Design a protein around this motif. Structure first.
Motif, short mmCIF file in Angstrom:
data_model
loop_
_atom_site.label_atom_id
_atom_site.label_comp_id
_atom_site.label_asym_id
_atom_site.label_seq_id
_atom_site.Cartn_x
_atom_site.Cartn_y
_atom_site.Cartn_z
N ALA A 127 -35.46 -17.38 -0.87
CA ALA A 127 -34.38 -16.52 -0.36
C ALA A 127 -34.85 -15.09 -0.30
O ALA A 127 -35.47 -14.58 -1.24
CB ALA A 127 -33.16 -16.63 -1.25
N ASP A 128 -34.53 -14.43 0.80
CA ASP A 128 -34.90 -13.03 0.99
C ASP A 128 -33.86 -12.11 0.36
O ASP A 128 -34.16 -10.96 0.02
CB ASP A 128 -35.02 -12.69 2.48
N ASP A 129 -32.63 -12.62 0.21
CA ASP A 129 -31.51 -11.87 -0.33
C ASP A 129 -31.02 -12.45 -1.65
O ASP A 129 -31.27 -13.61 -1.98
CB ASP A 129 -30.34 -11.87 0.64
N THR A 130 -30.31 -11.63 -2.40
CA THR A 130 -29.70 -12.06 -3.64
C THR A 130 -28.21 -12.28 -3.40
O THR A 130 -27.48 -11.32 -3.14
CB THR A 130 -29.91 -11.00 -4.74
N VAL A 131 -27.76 -13.53 -3.46
CA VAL A 131 -26.35 -13.85 -3.21
C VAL A 131 -25.60 -14.48 -4.39
O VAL A 131 -25.92 -15.57 -4.86
CB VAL A 131 -26.16 -14.75 -1.98
N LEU A 132 -24.56 -13.78 -4.84
CA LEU A 132 -23.79 -14.21 -5.99
C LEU A 132 -22.45 -14.84 -5.60
O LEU A 132 -21.87 -14.48 -4.57
CB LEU A 132 -23.56 -13.03 -6.93
N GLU A 133 -21.98 -15.77 -6.42
CA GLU A 133 -20.64 -16.32 -6.27
C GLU A 133 -19.59 -15.22 -6.26
O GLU A 133 -19.84 -14.10 -6.69
CB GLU A 133 -20.34 -17.29 -7.41
N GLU A 134 -18.40 -15.57 -5.76
CA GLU A 134 -17.31 -14.62 -5.67
C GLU A 134 -16.95 -14.08 -7.04
O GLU A 134 -16.62 -14.84 -7.94
CB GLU A 134 -16.08 -15.28 -5.05
N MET A 135 -17.01 -12.77 -7.19
CA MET A 135 -16.71 -12.15 -8.47
C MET A 135 -16.10 -10.76 -8.26
O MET A 135 -16.02 -10.28 -7.12
CB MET A 135 -17.99 -12.02 -9.28
N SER A 136 -15.67 -10.13 -9.35
CA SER A 136 -15.19 -8.75 -9.30
C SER A 136 -16.34 -7.76 -9.33
O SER A 136 -17.07 -7.68 -10.31
CB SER A 136 -14.25 -8.45 -10.47
N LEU A 137 -16.49 -7.00 -8.25
CA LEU A 137 -17.58 -6.05 -8.14
C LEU A 137 -17.08 -4.74 -7.56
O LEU A 137 -16.69 -4.67 -6.40
CB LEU A 137 -18.70 -6.65 -7.28
N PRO A 138 -17.07 -3.68 -8.39
CA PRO A 138 -16.52 -2.40 -7.93
C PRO A 138 -17.44 -1.77 -6.89
O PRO A 138 -18.55 -2.27 -6.66
CB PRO A 138 -16.49 -1.56 -9.21
N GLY A 139 -16.97 -0.70 -6.26
CA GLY A 139 -17.78 0.01 -5.29
C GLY A 139 -17.37 -0.30 -3.87
O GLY A 139 -16.24 -0.71 -3.60
N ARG A 140 -18.31 -0.09 -2.95
CA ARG A 140 -18.07 -0.26 -1.52
C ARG A 140 -19.12 -1.17 -0.90
O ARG A 140 -20.27 -1.23 -1.34
CB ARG A 140 -18.08 1.12 -0.84
N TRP A 141 -18.71 -1.88 0.15
CA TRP A 141 -19.59 -2.85 0.79
C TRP A 141 -19.50 -2.79 2.32
O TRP A 141 -18.73 -2.01 2.88
CB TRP A 141 -19.27 -4.27 0.30
N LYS A 142 -20.31 -3.61 2.97
CA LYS A 142 -20.22 -3.80 4.41
C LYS A 142 -20.30 -5.29 4.73
O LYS A 142 -20.99 -6.04 4.03
CB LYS A 142 -21.33 -3.00 5.11
N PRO A 143 -19.58 -5.73 5.78
CA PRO A 143 -19.29 -7.14 6.08
C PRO A 143 -20.43 -7.98 6.71
O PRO A 143 -20.20 -8.64 7.73
CB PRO A 143 -18.10 -7.05 7.05
N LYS A 144 -21.59 -8.01 6.07
CA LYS A 144 -22.73 -8.77 6.56
C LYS A 144 -22.50 -10.29 6.57
O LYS A 144 -21.79 -10.83 5.72
CB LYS A 144 -23.97 -8.44 5.71
N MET A 145 -23.12 -10.97 7.53
CA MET A 145 -23.13 -12.43 7.58
C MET A 145 -24.55 -12.97 7.44
O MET A 145 -25.50 -12.34 7.91
CB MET A 145 -22.50 -12.96 8.88
N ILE A 146 -24.70 -14.14 6.82
CA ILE A 146 -26.02 -14.71 6.53
C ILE A 146 -26.06 -16.22 6.75
O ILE A 146 -25.02 -16.86 6.88
CB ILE A 146 -26.47 -14.40 5.10
N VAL A 147 -27.27 -16.77 6.77
CA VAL A 147 -27.47 -18.17 7.13
C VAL A 147 -28.45 -18.92 6.20
O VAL A 147 -29.38 -18.33 5.65
CB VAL A 147 -27.95 -18.28 8.60
N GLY A 148 -28.22 -20.22 6.05
CA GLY A 148 -29.07 -21.07 5.23
C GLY A 148 -29.49 -22.30 6.00
O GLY A 148 -30.08 -22.18 7.06
N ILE A 149 -29.18 -23.48 5.46
CA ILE A 149 -29.59 -24.73 6.10
C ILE A 149 -28.45 -25.42 6.83
O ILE A 149 -28.63 -25.86 7.97
CB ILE A 149 -30.18 -25.74 5.10
N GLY A 150 -27.31 -25.53 6.18
CA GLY A 150 -26.16 -26.22 6.75
C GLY A 150 -25.27 -25.33 7.61
O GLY A 150 -24.17 -25.73 7.99
N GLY A 151 -25.75 -24.13 7.91
CA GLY A 151 -25.00 -23.19 8.72
C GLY A 151 -25.01 -21.77 8.20
O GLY A 151 -25.98 -21.32 7.60
N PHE A 152 -23.91 -21.06 8.41
CA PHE A 152 -23.83 -19.65 8.03
C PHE A 152 -22.59 -19.31 7.20
O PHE A 152 -21.58 -20.00 7.29
CB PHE A 152 -23.87 -18.77 9.29
#
Ligand SMILES: CC(C)(C)NC(=O)[C@@H]1C[C@@H]2CCCC[C@@H]2CN1C[C@@H](O)[C@H](Cc1ccccc1)NC(=O)[C@H](CC(N)=O)NC(=O)c1ccc2ccccc2n1
Length: 198
Positions: A127-152
Motif C-alpha cells: 500500500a502506498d497510503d496509510t488507511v485507518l478504520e473509521e475513527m474520531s480524528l480532529p483537524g481538517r481533511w479533504k475528500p480523496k477517493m482511493i482504490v484496491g482490488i475489489g473496487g474503490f
C-alpha cells in the motif's frame, strides 16, 4: 538483499514460462497475478480486499521464480491492476520486514497510537497510503477517493496526523474510511525505517 519502500517494491518473476513484474505485498496473504496463460486445473476461489471483491482461479504447486529464487505454492489469477506477491510466497523465498525483524509467517501487525487512541494495524509494503478504520480524528481533511482490488472507496484525507508505531514517531498523511483493516502504508513505513530482506 535489502529493499526500501521509498519506491514501490517491485520484482521480476518468472511464472508459466513468461516474465512479469510484481509487487511484494506484506499486506496480502495471497499471491495474485493479472490474467495470464497458466496450465493445469484450478479452483474457483474468490479473493477480497478494499474496494470490494474479485473472483480468481486458484492454482496449486505452481513454480515461480522471484528475483532468481525458486518457490512453489498457490498462485491465483484474475483481474488485478497489479501483479502481487503475497505472504504465502514471501515467507518461502525468505522475506523479512526489518526496522528488529518481523516475519511474514503471520500477518505483520503492530499497535499504533494515533489521536490519543490505540489501534492494531497491518504493515503493508503493498500500500502506498496509510488507511485507518473509521475513527474520531480532529483537524481538517479533504475528500480523496482511493482504490484496491475489489473496487474503490471514499475516505477522509487528514494530513500532518501524528502516529506512534511500535514505539517510534512519524507525522504524515492518514486516511479514514470503511476499510476492514488498518493499513500502515509506504508513506509512514518509510519514515520509521522498515525494509524488506531475503
Ligand atoms: C491501501 C491502498 C492505498 C488502497 N492500496 C491498496 O489497497 C493496494 C491496491 C493495490 C492495487 C490493486 C491490487 C492490490 C494492490 C495492493 N493493495 C494493498 C494490499 O496489501 C491489500 C491490503 C488489504 C489488506 C486487507 C484488507 C484489504 C486490503 N491486500 C489485499 O488486497 C489482499 C488480497 C489477498 N491477499 O488475497 N487481502 C488480504 O490479504 C486480506 C486479508 C484479510 C482480510 C480480512 C477481511 C477482508 C479482507 C481481507 N483481505
Amino acid at each position: 538483499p535489502q529493499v526500501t519502500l521509498w519506491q514501490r517494491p517491485l520484482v521480476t518473476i518468472k511464472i508459466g514460462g513468461q516474465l512479469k513484474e510484481a509487487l511484494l505485498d506484506t499486506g496480502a496473504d495471497d499471491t495474485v497475478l493479472e490474467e495470464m496463460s497458466l496450465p493445469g486445473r484450478w479452483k474457483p476461489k474468490m479473493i477480497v480486499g478494499i474496494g470490494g471483491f474479485i473472483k480468481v482461479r486458484q492454482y496449486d504447486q505452481i513454480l515461480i521464480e522471484i528475483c532468481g529464487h525458486k518457490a512453489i505454492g498457490t498462485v491465483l489469477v484474475g483481474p488485478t491492476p497489479v501483479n502481487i506477491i503475497g505472504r504465502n510466497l514471501l515467507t518461502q523465498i525468505g522475506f523479512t520486514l526489518n526496522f528488529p525483524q518481523v516475519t511474514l509467517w503471520q500477518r505483520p501487525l503492530v499497535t499504533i497510537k494515533i489521536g490519543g487512541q490505540l489501534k492494531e494495524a497491518l504493515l503493508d509494503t503493498g500500500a502506498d497510503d496509510t488507511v485507518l478504520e473509521e475513527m474520531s480524528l480532529p483537524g481538517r481533511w479533504k475528500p480523496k477517493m482511493i482504490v484496491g482490488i475489489g473496487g474503490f472507496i471514499k475516505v477522509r484525507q487528514y494530513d500532518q496526523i501524528l502516529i506512534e508505531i511500535c514505539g517510534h514517531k512519524a507525522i504524515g498523511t492518514v486516511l479514514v474510511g470503511p476499510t476492514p483493516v488498518n493499513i500502515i502504508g509506504r508513506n509512514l513505513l518509510t519514515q520509521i525505517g522498515f525494509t524488506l530482506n531475503f
